[PDB]
């Protein structure tokens, strides 16, 4: 077996999403929380269907999500993973080679407390990609990446251990 440094395992994006199931000030609060964590502008996901138990009317503003790349999401992964004690479960790893973990108490990320800032829940999801991702994501001559280019679960766990010095159960 010959290996190119082309095979590098990269963090594609960290998506951090917060679902409050409400239209109101708590939303604006999670927005702020997110801006303050990312340095970017938060994205508002709507509420697609109506449910009485969840109090969600279709096309209603529901949740706040953020897409972060590079050193930002790197540094933050530092934050949350540490918040998670650098410990994950195999159930946390998908067949995409991409992993995710939950966090509550966003304060444990190192952000201050305000009445508008009351403690929030967050889903952290990490996409891992190899180098040729572009082929799939581009417009002209769009094509699907090769079998040898795509990242296996075992490979992803390996990435988490090898990089973060973490434990998996």
């Amino acid at each position: 077996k010959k290996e190119n440094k082309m095979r590098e395992v990269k963090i594609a994006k960290l998506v951090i999403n917060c679902c409050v199931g409400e239209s109101g000030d708590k939303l604006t609060k999670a927005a702020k929380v997110l801006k303050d964590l990312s340095g970017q502008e938060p994205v508002f996901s709507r509420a697609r269907y109506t449910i009485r138990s969840f109090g969600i009317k279709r096309n209603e503003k529901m949740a706040v999500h953020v897409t972060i790349r590079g050193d930002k999401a790197r540094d933050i992964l530092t934050r949350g993973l540490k918040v998670k004690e650098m410990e994950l479960r195999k159930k946390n790893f998908s067949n995409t080679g991409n992993f995710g973990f939950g966090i509550q108490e966003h304060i444990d990320l190192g952000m201050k407390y305000d009445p508008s800032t009351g403690i929030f829940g967050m889903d952290f999801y990490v996409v891992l990609e190899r180098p040729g991702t572009r082929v799939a994501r581009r417009r002209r001559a769009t094509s699907r990446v090769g079998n040898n280019q795509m990242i296996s679960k075992e490979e992803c766990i390996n990435w988490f251990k090898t990089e973060f010095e973490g434990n998996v159960y």
Partner: protein, 298 residues
Amino acid sequence: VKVLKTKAYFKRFQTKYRRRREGLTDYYARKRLIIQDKDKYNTPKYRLVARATNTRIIAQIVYATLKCDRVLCAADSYELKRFGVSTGLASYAAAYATGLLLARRLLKQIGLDTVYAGQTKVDGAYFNVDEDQKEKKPFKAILDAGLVRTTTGNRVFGVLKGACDGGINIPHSESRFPGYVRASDEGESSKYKPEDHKARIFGKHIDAYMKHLKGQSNEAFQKQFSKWSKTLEAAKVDSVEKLFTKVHAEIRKNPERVKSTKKNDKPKRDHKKFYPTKLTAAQRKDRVKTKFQLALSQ
């Protein structure tokens, strides 16, 4: 897992156009472009293909024949090598140049050079020869931008300028030309600043860039410009603008096909091996017998 790709699925597949599954042609667009009024029965229709490469800027004049589409004139950015540019063949200026060359060539082929010069000094002002046409109308071409986005200040429009300045009629409204401004806040102005555009045609932007990179560090300037700087030195010039005015005048002056006189005879052995022929039925049979025995004795 329910198998969601069935035998059926395949019987039912509508195979898309070879050209569309390659992500090359936009047929909606293309049809829009090619349609001419059957009123002019057999009369040809001329489109300018601006195709950008991670290296070369290819500008062509094609028209649509049933069996095939035909190329009238082809300008490959590498011809700028012939005039002394080894690097940055994908830039705005490169587009401009290539377009100027395709222009002059077509115009020479027809015999319209004399009648049609273009604006020799470059402004950024709308330039279409169609205002001063007198005896023989300027050549008509349509811009085919292809899969590329129409973003304001796109290379394809560099080629645009190259070619209408070269003297071809290339209908354009200058709205997506670099240095065009549409204001939002108070509904202020439609601003055209030909200065920024021309500046971009010559590559002043690339120069200001060199300078920035120098300001920060030597490594910075090295990383992005290594080949570009050694190349700027080989022409013994201090700026891209002087080099591209050189390219401009040389192109304007003796633009022509450079015919490479190289004659090659028979060096094929290597890659005839890399490009295997398909196997005979007998061969597959043999394969089967082999796998069979290997299996049996195991």
